[PDB]
UniProtKB/TrEMBL annotation:
SUPFAM superfamilies for this protein: Probable bacterial effector-binding domain (SSF55136)
S-S bonds: 5-9
The species this protein was found in: Chlorobaculum tepidum (strain ATCC 49652 / DSM 12025 / NBRC 103806 / TLS)
Superkingdom classification of source: Bacteria
Record's protein name: AraC effector-binding domain-containing protein
Residue span, AraC effector-binding domain: 7-156
Pfam families according to UniProt: GyrI-like (PF06445)
Amino acid sequence: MDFECQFVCELKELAPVPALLIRTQTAMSELGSLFEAGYHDILQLLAGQGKSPSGPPFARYFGMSAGTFEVEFGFPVEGGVEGSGRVVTGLTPSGKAASSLYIGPYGEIEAVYDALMKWVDDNGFDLSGEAYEIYLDNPAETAPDQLRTRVSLMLHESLEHHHHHH
């Protein structure tokens, strides 16, 4: 169960980007609906200052596999933006983590978690910090096989998240 060989995982660092986000703790049976509305309606500050994010939204969540974890929507700006309430502007630090770009149609994203869980296990590395998802462009309109999501997760802790279709 060492050399199982599944996908190609890379040790990639996180980049320091000016990003506004709402750090909110939520559950797995909530995260989905949360992101939908969060990407659609994001700050009268941003969408009311007459400007746009300088890149695609990256959803980072802090907290190993648990009932409720702390998520941050993470929208990329240039720096001259302000937040309000719980959705405020911040800065990301750099750090090494296991990341892999999921390019193509979606499904049980748990399958890729298990993959990245395994390679770092063999490596003998430890937790990176928080986990990262990211949505580049809109699905279906630019073909499914061009939907790319560099999914990064914590290194060797638990990450027990499984849908299981059987």
